[PDB]
Design an enzyme around this catalytic site. Structure first.
Site, short mmCIF file in Angstrom:
data_model
loop_
_atom_site.label_atom_id
_atom_site.label_comp_id
_atom_site.label_asym_id
_atom_site.label_seq_id
_atom_site.Cartn_x
_atom_site.Cartn_y
_atom_site.Cartn_z
N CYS A 118 -79.42 64.10 -58.09
CA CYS A 118 -78.15 63.89 -57.40
C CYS A 118 -77.00 64.59 -58.09
O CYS A 118 -76.99 64.77 -59.32
CB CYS A 118 -77.88 62.40 -57.27
SG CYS A 118 -78.95 61.69 -56.00
N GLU A 132 -69.76 58.40 -51.99
CA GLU A 132 -70.59 59.04 -53.02
C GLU A 132 -70.15 60.45 -53.38
O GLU A 132 -70.82 61.08 -54.22
CB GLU A 132 -72.04 58.98 -52.60
CG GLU A 132 -72.59 57.54 -52.86
CD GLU A 132 -72.50 57.15 -54.31
OE1 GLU A 132 -72.94 57.97 -55.14
OE2 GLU A 132 -71.94 56.05 -54.61
N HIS A 181 -72.54 57.88 -57.94
CA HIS A 181 -73.42 56.94 -58.61
C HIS A 181 -74.04 57.51 -59.88
O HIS A 181 -74.65 56.73 -60.64
CB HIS A 181 -74.53 56.42 -57.67
CG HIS A 181 -75.58 57.44 -57.34
ND1 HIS A 181 -75.42 58.38 -56.35
CD2 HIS A 181 -76.83 57.63 -57.83
CE1 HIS A 181 -76.54 59.12 -56.25
NE2 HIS A 181 -77.40 58.69 -57.16
#
Lengths: 161, 181
Positions: free
Chosen positions: B139, B54, B30
């Site tokens: 992330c 992911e 993402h």
């Protein structure tokens, strides 16, 4: 920003509790220094309680910091955090379950403090002494002592007398 | 972790990614720059882009980061393993966050199917109450543990609870939308 209170000091680190109050582990103090943070040593009120060393400066040094609550260890069972800084730049927070308060003999020296067990079962090393143990109580950070020793999971937090 | 590990973590899109080897880069899907024409100077159509939910792995046709040695990449870790989540912040901090890796599972997060391994941060009683956990922007940072003398990378940071210690590491082979290349 709590991290900015942890500063290299002698053979370890220490922690600015307030603008004028700096704490460290006694054995890391550089023994041939004439001044700390630009202040001649004899003008600093340096109190040693075993391995817990408090330096009270005669004028504010770190005016960017607020005064933090300083207590003598924590309740048994408290999960505190040891805030380790390393000379590579790393900021390494380690949880530790705090245990018994005691006065022990470590390498022939008397050490008042509190035992802990790191929850990593990722640990502490030479150079880490003087880093602070802290926990959060409600909305308050509480500093409870300074890192002084560890087994080659057991750690020792030296506490104020 | 040694500086040769930290230098492998670089900004990427809205997060970070990690050079596993000179030709292999991992990140969280993402965070990837959308509509990008190239990554690291290579046109997208020349890259092998593998996605497992992911977890995103970019394999380049020739070495890019020739300063790094190749590291073992595994699909998560055994339950109970203590790993380090290597966080970099844009303010310059290097923050290795200890984490106990837990159950492999598949989550539904923001309507997306996200496979991986749940972890528990070991940085304090409640990492979020203490500002000792993870935040937006983190992330793609890697989870790594040492097995004997070998470092092992096990996945990338993808999500975390709003309070407490729970974090999610997306892993190779995990459930979710997939691409082979």
């Amino acid at each position: 920003s709590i991290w900015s209170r942890i500063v290299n000091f002698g053979s370890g680190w220490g922690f600015w509790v307030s603008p004028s109050l700096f704490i460290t582990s006694t054995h890391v103090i550089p023994q041939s220094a004439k001044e700390f943070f630009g202040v001649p040593i004899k003008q600093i009120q340096i109190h040693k309680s075993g391995e817990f060393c408090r330096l009270r400066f005669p004028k504010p040094i770190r005016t960017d910091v607020t005064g933090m609550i300083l207590e003598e260890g924590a309740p048994e069972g408290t999960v505190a955090t040891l805030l380790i800084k390393r000379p590579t730049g790393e900021l390494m927070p380690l949880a530790a379950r705090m245990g018994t308060h005691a006065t022990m003999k470590i390498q022939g020296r008397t050490v008042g403090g509190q035992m802990g067990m790191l929850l990593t079962g990722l640990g502490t090393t030479p150079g880490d002494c003087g880093c602070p143990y802290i926990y959060k109580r409600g909305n308050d950070y509480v500093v409870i002592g300074v890192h002084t020793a560890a087994a080659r999971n057991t750690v020792i937090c030296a506490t104020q007398g």
